[PDB]
Structure formats: structure tokens, C-alpha cells
Design an enzyme around this catalytic site. Structure first.
Site, PDB file in Angstrom:
ATOM      1  N   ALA A 194       3.809   2.117   4.723  1.00 47.26           N
ATOM      2  CA  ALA A 194       3.929   3.166   4.286  1.00 47.26           C
ATOM      3  C   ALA A 194       2.536   3.576   5.033  1.00 47.26           C
ATOM      4  O   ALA A 194       1.625   3.255   4.204  1.00 47.26           O
ATOM      5  CB  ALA A 194       4.411   4.480   3.464  1.00 47.26           C
TER       6      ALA A 194
ATOM      7  N   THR B 285      -9.819   8.806   8.588  1.00 47.26           N
ATOM      8  CA  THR B 285     -10.740   7.720   9.275  1.00 47.26           C
ATOM      9  C   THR B 285      -9.712   7.679  10.920  1.00 47.26           C
ATOM     10  O   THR B 285      -7.942   7.527  10.240  1.00 47.26           O
ATOM     11  CB  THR B 285     -10.577   6.543   9.066  1.00 47.26           C
ATOM     12  OG1 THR B 285     -10.291   6.049   8.656  1.00 47.26           O
ATOM     13  CG2 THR B 285     -12.138   7.241   7.619  1.00 47.26           C
TER      14      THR B 285
ATOM     15  N   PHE C  98       0.240  -1.825   0.019  1.00 47.01           N
ATOM     16  CA  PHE C  98      -0.140   0.229   0.359  1.00 47.01           C
ATOM     17  C   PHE C  98       0.995   1.153   0.009  1.00 47.01           C
ATOM     18  O   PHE C  98       1.593   1.295   0.502  1.00 47.01           O
ATOM     19  CB  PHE C  98      -1.213  -0.031   1.491  1.00 47.01           C
ATOM     20  CG  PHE C  98      -2.445   0.395   1.361  1.00 47.01           C
ATOM     21  CD1 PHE C  98      -3.240   1.085   0.409  1.00 47.01           C
ATOM     22  CD2 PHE C  98      -1.920   1.633   1.881  1.00 47.01           C
ATOM     23  CE1 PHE C  98      -3.998   1.336  -0.322  1.00 47.01           C
ATOM     24  CE2 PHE C  98      -3.568   3.277   1.445  1.00 47.01           C
ATOM     25  CZ  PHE C  98      -4.193   2.566   0.452  1.00 47.01           C
TER      26      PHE C  98
ATOM     27  N   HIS D 133      -8.441   4.766  11.130  1.00 52.78           N
ATOM     28  CA  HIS D 133      -7.683   3.904  10.751  1.00 52.78           C
ATOM     29  C   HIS D 133      -6.431   3.839  10.827  1.00 52.78           C
ATOM     30  O   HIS D 133      -5.447   3.387  10.904  1.00 52.78           O
ATOM     31  CB  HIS D 133      -8.253   3.579   9.124  1.00 52.78           C
ATOM     32  CG  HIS D 133      -7.521   2.076   8.858  1.00 52.78           C
ATOM     33  ND1 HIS D 133      -7.854   1.273   8.939  1.00 52.78           N
ATOM     34  CD2 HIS D 133      -6.816   1.887   7.791  1.00 52.78           C
ATOM     35  CE1 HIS D 133      -7.563   0.200   8.948  1.00 52.78           C
ATOM     36  NE2 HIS D 133      -6.644   0.435   7.351  1.00 52.78           N
TER      37      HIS D 133
ATOM     38  N   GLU E 254      -0.190  -6.697   7.743  1.00 52.33           N
ATOM     39  CA  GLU E 254      -0.299  -8.253   7.156  1.00 52.33           C
ATOM     40  C   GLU E 254       1.389  -8.095   7.467  1.00 52.33           C
ATOM     41  O   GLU E 254       1.925  -9.715   7.421  1.00 52.33           O
ATOM     42  CB  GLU E 254      -0.228  -8.374   6.200  1.00 52.33           C
ATOM     43  CG  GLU E 254      -2.135  -7.634   5.488  1.00 52.33           C
ATOM     44  CD  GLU E 254      -3.067  -7.138   5.561  1.00 52.33           C
ATOM     45  OE1 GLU E 254      -1.865  -5.958   5.050  1.00 52.33           O
ATOM     46  OE2 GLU E 254      -4.006  -6.695   5.633  1.00 52.33           O
TER      47      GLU E 254
END
Ligand code: CL
Ligand code: CL
Ligand code: CL
Ligand code: CL
Ligand code: CL
Ligand code: CL
Lengths: 151, 150, 152, 153, 154
Positions: free
Chosen positions: B80, B86, B22, B88, B58
Site C-alpha cells: 500500500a 511529499t 510498509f 514521494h 523493492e
């Protein structure tokens, strides 16, 4: 040029467990369909997938833990939505549910996809439900195959 | 006072890398800077393994299985976490760092924390290469520091 | 159509342990009354439910832990209220009480319903006390049955 | 009431102290360590009973202190370094995780670890606290090492 | 209706062995707590010959002391005293979080209740207002919880 394991998104023959926190009902339902179709699209057979439900995100930990202990599944998926309300209960549920998901994967070795939204509004959860469900199917498949390697 | 001196010597060490894809461009810049610094310290390209996972959450399971095999003198976590809209961000930042810390403590395998926790894509870009090199420097030194203490 | 386990809300024959943190007593009592009434409506026998109390939420962990270790209960319930005052004590009590509840359920396998409110005002606790008490009964009953399906 | 009150014992004589130094913010760490060793000697610890190690940053303190604690060669440990707030949530991550590791190591092995890692907002705050923090960690390590020995048998 | 077994609190210290650890930083606050705590312990029936008191420099050092005392199983319950008062840095959050987590963790792992009497406040003035009350409260928590653990040991 180092040895580079390539991602394997091949569901064929994988056993996947799913736990859905029902609170914010509409949100959880959208995630699960996006998750299941992506699982089948990835090669997971409907006969190799089990789906269970829990009232809320704080109850995910005990359920996902029992499934990991059975070692019947190559990877697990956690679904649900925590939407900020009026109280510090949002931070508590967000922290503890995420920590339990993290802890189960570490101790049992079974990857657990964290599909639990931690958002401020119903609209944010709606915008993310289907996409995150699909992402959780992709994470479970890759991490299950990644787990088989390294064994 | 006996003072152990730092040892920066890759010299045949087996270093493991896990990259959270990501924010892919950021991870690739870290990995490129990381491998380049590893070779500059003496780690053989055939003795370092690179693995990939979708996201920082993960990392824990991947780094954990690699640590348990005891095939690696030290581990490196790359990726990163960039603040979005949010909570999150706080969840991924806290849990990913806690796992990296926990694997090092329980297993004895040092794990360099190369996971950025920033507010903007621009902050991740400014730091990607520098942090990748630093994780190679930390991984090499901490692998060697374990030997003086095992 | 994957195998989809359906919720089981059948208390018949379940043994439930309840720990009530008394600080902010009126809230804890409202939760307990709503919780017991809902437990009976789900089929839980009054003779199979034990209720204990502790001064505050930070004392929930040790009590819930001994009850879990006895393995006399299919599920546990934690009740009480943490109401923000003037100090960081609110964040500490909220975090540690919730973390212990999570940890006990995870390690012993006995589901623990988290019925500890973490709110800013007395009025918020009052508005939520009865609903959270009843909800904790539904969580305890359902999760006790869910555990049994995965025990074998 | 007149309960038995165990009195602090600040007599380092014969104690073996281990130190792990996070090098990041270089000037802060050595200023702490020079102040720390000077106070250790003032407390009665011989220079031959102290080991000193360095790690790149506070996040690497945990694994180092862990190897030393497992050996059970040390009566008490000390962690030094400085975490200074920058631009990102990295300050909170390093501060939380490093302190949690120091806490966890002391609980699990029974070897006290003095937390000498500053967690401040500015370099000026770190400088104002560096020297005092080295000395304080020596007093904590010696006293807590003896407290473990008392409670031991 | 539903009239289940309701175990009632037992506040009878007679014959209980209580261990206390006092974090000395902010000396006046910790000592005010300890006097209020011992005074309340005796009021509950706890013998001064059954109470041990130990000292540590600060709250971050509470965990290691409380842990060794708990493992001995010489104490029916433990009490932690002290004060963490916000200064200029994130050190306040770190000390408050880690000291509380250790107190909580010791109770879970050993089964020995540990009363959290560590104040976490913004000002010395708040600490002064609370020192005596929390000291007495920790005496009631330690006594009641020591008896509650015994009722569950069977
Ligand atoms: Cl587990
Ligand atoms: Cl339902
Ligand atoms: Cl436990
Ligand atoms: Cl350890
Ligand atoms: Cl009472
Ligand atoms: Cl312990």
C-alpha cells in the site's frame, strides 16, 4: 501455510556500494552517517563498503549503473535530496532519478535502495535525512540477501 | 468469432507473492484475503511462495528474479502506498506500477497489481481485503490465460 | 572509515561533446559561454571539445545519441531552455528531453550533463543560464573521471 | 509540391484481428465490442478471422496482447475497456500503464494495436463514448493492418 | 579562452528523402500543417519526388507507422503531424504523452530524426494559430537534423 522467506538482516560478508548526490550538501552528509553506522550495526565490514559522490540526483543513474555492471556488489544504495524550488525541474529530477534507480535494479538484478528524498522544503529533508539513511542500509542488506536466494 | 472463456482454476498452480511491508497491517490483510481466495480456487498451500520486501520500490527486483526463474505461472504484488506530505507518493506509485507492468510484458508472467495507491489509511483499510482477493482472482485467471495462448 | 572515492575535477585530456538546443537562443548562448569557460578552467583543451546545435530540446536526443555511439567523447553536455507558454507542450518537451538524456547516459555509459532548463518565465531562464552552463562543465568533467574509475 | 500520398485502405477482406477486452466496467466493454464487431464486418472482416479474449482489468491487457502479438498470427490488435475515475490515484496509474503497454507492443512487434480503452471521469462519459469507440477501433485496426502490409516489403 | 569546433547548422534539403505521417483527427489542422510543411520543404530544396506522405487516424497510431518507415532507412528524416486538443477526459494527457514518447523513442533507437509536429493544445483556436508555423518548423527541423545526422555518421 505457504513457504515464507524470512527477512535476513545479516550484513556479514556483503559488498555494498553507495552513491551520494551532493546537492543540498548538509542533507546528504546526514544520510550517509546514519547509513554507514546502520550498515556496521547490521554486520557490514568497513572494508566491504565503497562510497562515491555525484554532483546531483540526475547523475546517479550513470554511476549506479557502472557499479551494478561490475557485479562486485550484492546491493547498492542511492542517497541525496531533491528539494522543490521555483520550476518544473523538481518534477523532472524526481521522476528521472527514481526511474533510473528502479531501472538499474530490474536489469542488473542488483537491489538499489532509493534513498533520494523528493520533498518541498529544507525542513522536510532535515527531518527525514537520518531516518531514511538508516532505512536504506536496512533495505540494501535485506534485499542483497533476498537476491542471493531466488538465484 | 472464437471467444476464449475465462478459466478460474488454481488447480496445482504455483503462484508467487511479494508483500511490501510498509503499512504493515494493510499488507497483512491483503495477504490473508489473498491466500484465502487462492485456496478457494484450488491452489495448494505448498505450491504458493510468499516473500517480503520493505516497500513498494523493492517489489520490482523481487518480482523480477522470481519471474526469470519461470517457476511460477503467475505473480502477485501486495502493499500500500498512502499519500503523505511529499512527491514521494507519486514516485513510488508510478515506479512500482510501471515495474509490475514491465515484468509481465517482457517475461510473459502475468503479475497482479495489488499495490494500493490511496490518500489515507482509511481508504487502504476499506480496500485491503477486497483487493487481496481480486489479486488472487486475477493471478489465477491470467496464469491460465497464458496457457491458452502460449 | 569505508573506502571513499573523492571527486576528481581534472579535465586534462578529457574529450567533451556539447549539444545546444537553440530555441530561446539567448539562454542557450549564455549557457555555452559559461560552460566552455568553466571547462577550460578545469583543464579541458579547446581542441578536444566539439559543439553542435539543434533547433529544440526534442532534437537533443538523436544528436546526443549519435555522439555517444561514436564513443569519441568521455562525457556529453546538453544545453538549452524550455520555457512554459500556453499549452501542454511544455510538459511534453520537458519530460521527453530529460528522459532521453537519462536514457542515453544509462545505456551507453557516457555521462550526460542535463543542462536543459525547464522554467516558467524568460526571467527565470536568464537568472539560471550562466550558473547551469558552468555547472554542466563541472558535472561533465567530474562524471567523466568517475566513469573511468569504474570502467576497468 | 506533389509528393506521393499513400491513400488509406479500409478493406478488411482476409484480415485476422485479435481483441482483448478489459471486463471491469462490464456494460461499457461489451457495448464497445458489439459496436466493434459490427463495424469490422462492415469493413469486410470475416467472423472466422477474429479472436476475442477477456481480462479482469486494464492492467492485465498488456500481458495478454503481448502473447498474441508474439505469435504473429494477427494483422492488428484491439484493446477495449474503460477506466473511470474513482477516489484514488489508481485512475492515473491504470490509465498511464495500460496505454503505455498498448503503445509499446505496437512499436516493438510492428502489429498495430488500436487503443480502445476509455479514460474518463464518470460512468456517463463512458456510456456516451462506448459505442463510437468500438467502431473507431475497428476502422483503426483494419487501416493500420493494411498500412503495415504496404510498408512491409 | 575556449574556441572549440562549432559545427554549423546545414539547412540544405537538396537530395534529402523525407517521410511524413499525418494524424488525420482534427482534419483541418493536420492538412494546414501538411501544406505549410511541404511548401517549406520545397523552399529548402527538397524534391517532391523524394518526399513520401502517409496517413493515420490519430496520434496514438503515429508510432507504429513512423517506426516501420524508420526501419527501412529509406528516409533521411521523418516528420509527424497532427493535433491533440483537450476535450473532457484524461484521454488528452494519455494521447499527448504516448505519441510524444514514441516519436522520441523512434529517433533514439534508429538514429533517424523524427520531427514532433504534433500540437498538444487546449482549444481548436490555439491549434489554428499554430498549424502553419509548426508545419514549416518541422520542415526546417527535418532538413537540418537529417544533415546533422549525416555529419555524425562518419
Ligand atoms: Cl543498464
Ligand atoms: Cl566539488
Ligand atoms: Cl540508445
Ligand atoms: Cl514485447
Ligand atoms: Cl538556422
Ligand atoms: Cl524501435
Amino acid at each position: 501455510n505457504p513457504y515464507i522467506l524470512t527477512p535476513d538482516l545479516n550484513g556479514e560478508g556483503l559488498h555494498i556500494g553507495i552513491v551520494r548526490a551532493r546537492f543540498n550538501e548538509e542533507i546528504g552528509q546526514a544520510q550517509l552517517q546514519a547509513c554507514l553506522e546502520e550498515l556496521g550495526k547490521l554486520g557490514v565490514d568497513e572494508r566491504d563498503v565503497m562510497v562515491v559522490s555525484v554532483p546531483g540526483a540526475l547523475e546517479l543513474g550513470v554511476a549506479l549503473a557502472r557499479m551494478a555492471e561490475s557485479y562486485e556488489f550484492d546491493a547498492l544504495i542511492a542517497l541525496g535530496a531533491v528539494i522543490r524550488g521555483e520550476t518544473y525541474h523538481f518534477e523532472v529530477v524526481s521522476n528521472e532519478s527514481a526511474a533510473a534507480i528502479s531501472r538499474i535494479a530490474l536489469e542488473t538484478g542488483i537491489p538499489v535502495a532509493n534513498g533520494v528524498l523528493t520533498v518541498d522544503t529544507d525542513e522536510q529533508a532535515q527531518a527525514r535525512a537520518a531516518g531514511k539513511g538508516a532505512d536504506c542500509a536496512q533495505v540494501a542488506v535485506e534485499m542483497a540477501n533476498l537476491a542471493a536466494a531466488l538465484e
